[PDB]
Amino acid sequence: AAHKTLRTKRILCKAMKVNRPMPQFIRQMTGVRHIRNPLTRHWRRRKMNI
Amino acid sequence: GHLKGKELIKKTRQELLDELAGLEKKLFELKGQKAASAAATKLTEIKNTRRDVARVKSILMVSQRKALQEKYAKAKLVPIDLRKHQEKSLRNKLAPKYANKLTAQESRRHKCLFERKFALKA
Amino acid sequence: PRRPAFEHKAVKPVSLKHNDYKIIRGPVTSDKSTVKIENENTMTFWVDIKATKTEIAAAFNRLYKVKPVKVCTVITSKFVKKAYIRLPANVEAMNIATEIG
Amino acid sequence: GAGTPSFGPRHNKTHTICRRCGNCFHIQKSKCAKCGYPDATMRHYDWEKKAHRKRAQGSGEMRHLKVTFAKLQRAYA
RNA sequence: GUAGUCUGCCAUACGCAGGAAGACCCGCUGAACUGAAGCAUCUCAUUAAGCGGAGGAAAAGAAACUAACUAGGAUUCCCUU
RNA sequence: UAAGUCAGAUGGAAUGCUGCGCGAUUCAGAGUAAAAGCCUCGUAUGACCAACCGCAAGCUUACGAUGGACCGGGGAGAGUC
RNA sequence: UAUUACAGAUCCUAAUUGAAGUAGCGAUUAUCCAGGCUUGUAUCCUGGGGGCUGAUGAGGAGUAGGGUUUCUGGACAACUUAAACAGAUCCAGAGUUAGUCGAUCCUAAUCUCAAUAAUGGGAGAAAGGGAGUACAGUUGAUAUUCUGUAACUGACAACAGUUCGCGGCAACGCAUACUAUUUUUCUCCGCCAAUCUUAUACCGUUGGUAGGGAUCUCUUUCCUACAUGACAGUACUAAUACCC
RNA sequence: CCAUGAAGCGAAAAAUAGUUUACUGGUCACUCGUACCGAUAACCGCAUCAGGUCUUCUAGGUAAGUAGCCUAUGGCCAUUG
RNA sequence: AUCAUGACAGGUUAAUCUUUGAAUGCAAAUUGCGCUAAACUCGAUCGAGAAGCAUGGGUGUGACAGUACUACA
């Protein structure tokens, strides 16, 4: 960046909208506990390698 | 409100197309207002009208296909859409008449040498 | 020259599909768009990602019956297209926005 | 010499995303190491029988193929 | 010049080939560790990996076959030899 | 598709404990607030009524097919063994 | 009937001691005082001292790479060798606007298909080639992209008015088409050294007027400010090259 | 200089044929990138690592100076008491 | 939504079937660069979308090339 391609930009979009906390209502629905979002990361710690 | 797939079959093609566009318009206005107003009840109305616009598209397409198959049925080399699905293997496997057909030597002897029934006495 | 013996694909589709209603998804609700409506007479919309400015200008005209002056086209970090549509001097952008709501 | 200081100028990318694999497509050599694109046949060897069955059928959706298993249950039961 | 043929190349109408999977099956190619208390023939082995190709099974198959008898009679597999 | 949500005490809950009944072509198994032949699904076993009920190939009465004997014949896979 | 008895294998996996409140808390200019906000600040902000960096700057901006770290609001279980209301941390929202900047288009080193009835086609540079934009303003984050104002380049249309070739001895000037072939030019090119000169910066002699700083004494002083874009025009001054 | 220092697309010109009248003065401009860092904590070194990594705009004084030393604009007290 | 104009997390079959991939209009670290008789569908004669267009080989059909063979001039 800048000067990213479009299909590069498509991946970086999907990588940041997927990065969030898990919703509250799944724990209320299924009753499971201790499920983490796997595709959470931090930009500084883990690099994507894409 | 929402409407059944049975009773749409009776209606005309052009009657469905004006029904379609009017039904699809009220989808677009609700997608505008879900940003502003949001909230319950609207979010079931947007669900139903998405299901209904499929209902109209679906029965148009089977109304087309049953009519349009009758045009090309009972005729050589039909279109690819109107051919039946099948497997790759089953198409290329030749029809069992050709596999099983008899040579002019073989058929003429099969006049006499067929697989006849028989039995024994007690 | 070429001329096939039958149509290959006989079934034509039921409607346009790539429609005026499905180009323009709907308006964007932010604090930036609120200022650009009032000040510059300039709307904002979420758009289909393959839609051109020529497609948007015609599609905006067919729905709301106002021919736009300019269209300027972002693709966001959310990977959906945003279209800043300037209306002409006569119409007010608040008056078009109140109809939609 | 060969450690921390010489890690500094490591900014170029040897491999890039591959279309068929989507995973290690060599830019200079232009071949997907993992899948062999663009060779028409897809890369696997019998010495990597472990790593192959991560890629091979079953791993993905099987949209067309799962309904053709399900027919053969009904016909023989 | 025209009217047949022969040979070549191009364009087009209609169905076919490719890719997946590969335990089993068919055809090639082909090691070494190892054993021989060393090692070179030999062995591991006409095996592993590699290349090419099939089917629900494949391949084989109707005598230029055994036998030496008081004679058997396509191919395949199991027991024994 | 059989036969006790039996009675009494204990318990948050009875399928266990004590005592009396009943089923079985069904005591395989599971569910049920606790260990269940009889609380529920089943299991067992015959009875019941709908759906079909067709694809090619060959037939079908004699100089039509097939075979034996006798008369008169031809040939049997080449850069292959 | 057996995956049948453990203290050792620098055994395997999992948890845990002493050493130990010990070693140590580095490198980077330097902190101090009064206020604000708070249960709570030397640390977060304001004001005032004292300092540092000292135009190859911890200044303002970009390739490659990172990918939301940017911006506003709220939050302190953890992290940022103590503290913390702070933060590149956590949470919720928001943000990247182009005919003129780039990519796209051309080829280079180089790579890859096809034909041989052929004499090639395609790929390959976000530092090479390459038509065309400037100022001012505006947002919490965007600007040569938005708004205002002024340009410019290309392609596709008809339509109105002019015009059917002349000047200079010459160097050359002024209003003139299209297709094709060939020929030439621009694009267009190493490194080093010297002289002359616009623009920008800086230092200057001459004054000046606006505001601010300084003052026991001295200083008609000291500091800041004194500016005009792309684009389009036609005067004569005066240059060097080359030609008549 | 025993070194002689890209190509191609594109554009204009000229010559020789042939066909000729020309010149000046409304609409539209697709596609994709655009935030911020650029080492000083945002890149590579497992990390907010005294390391490493291409370039740009470049003030005054001292001095031969793009040295060292001091200071406006800009940025800062990075550093437990 | 209830003795049905038939609820939905049920099970098939048929539609719809985004960008890709053998990937196939020519390419590709690019949302780059094409082409088309009618019909189709909006668009008001003429634009656009929709849908076409790969290589190899088979049979047919047509066209071109040849001082290849031959007859009649």
Tokens of B117: 């029934």
Mutation site for A-interface testing, chosen from D14, D17, D19 by largest number of A Cβ within 10 Å: D17
Residue type, B107: S
User: According to DSSP H, which parts of D22-75 are helical?
Assistant: 49-55, 63-75
Distance from chain centroid for Cα C41: 17
For residues C87 and C42, the answer to whether their CB atoms sit within 8 Å is: yes
* Contacting residues for B33 by C-beta, under 8 A, at least 6 apart: B42, C100, C101
Q: Which two tokens mark C93? A: 């952008």
Residue B35, classed as helix, strand or coil, is helix
Residues in contact with B95: Cβ distance below 8 Å, sequence separation at least 6, in sequence order: none
For residues D55 and D43, the answer to whether their CB atoms sit within 8 Å is: no
B120: Cβ contacts below 8 Å, ≥ 6 apart: none
Of C91, C30, C99, give the one whose Cα is nearest residue B32. Answer: C99
Chain B residues 25-54, Cβ below 7 A from strand F: none
Beta strands in D1-77 (DSSP E): 15-16, 25-26
Question: Do residues D26 and D33 touch, judged by C-beta distance below 8 A?
Answer: yes
How far is the alpha carbon of C67 from chain A, nearest alpha carbon, in Å?
30
Evaluate the CA torsion angle C51, C52, C55, C61 in order and state its sign: positive
| Contact: C6, B78; criterion CB under 8 Å | yes
Contacts of C among chains (3+ CB pairs under 8 A): A, B
Residues A10, C79: C-beta atoms closer than 8 Å: yes
**Among all strands, which nt has the closest C1' to C70 (CA)?**
G97
* Alpha carbon distances (Å) from D5 to C50, C58, C80, D1: 46, 59, 42, 6
Point out which residues pair with C42 in neighbouring strands: C86
8 A C-beta contact, residue C38 and residue C73: no
- The residue of chain A nearest to residue D25, with distances taken between CA atoms, is A50
CA–C1' distance D66–F1 (Å)? 38
Task: List beta partners, residue A47.
Answer: none
Residues B112, B107: Cα–Cα separation, whole Å: 9
> Which nucleotide across the nucleic acid strands is nearest to C54, CA versus C1'?
H30
Contact criterion met (CB below 8 Å) for A22 and A42: no
Cβ–Cβ contacts within 10 Å for residue D42, how many? Answer: 15
Please tell me what resolution, in angstroms, this structure has: 3.2
Stated as kind and residue range, the H or E segment containing C44 is strand C42-47
A16's CB contacts (< 8 A; 6+ apart) are C77
> Strand C81-86 vs strand C24-27: parallel, antiparallel, or unpaired?
unpaired
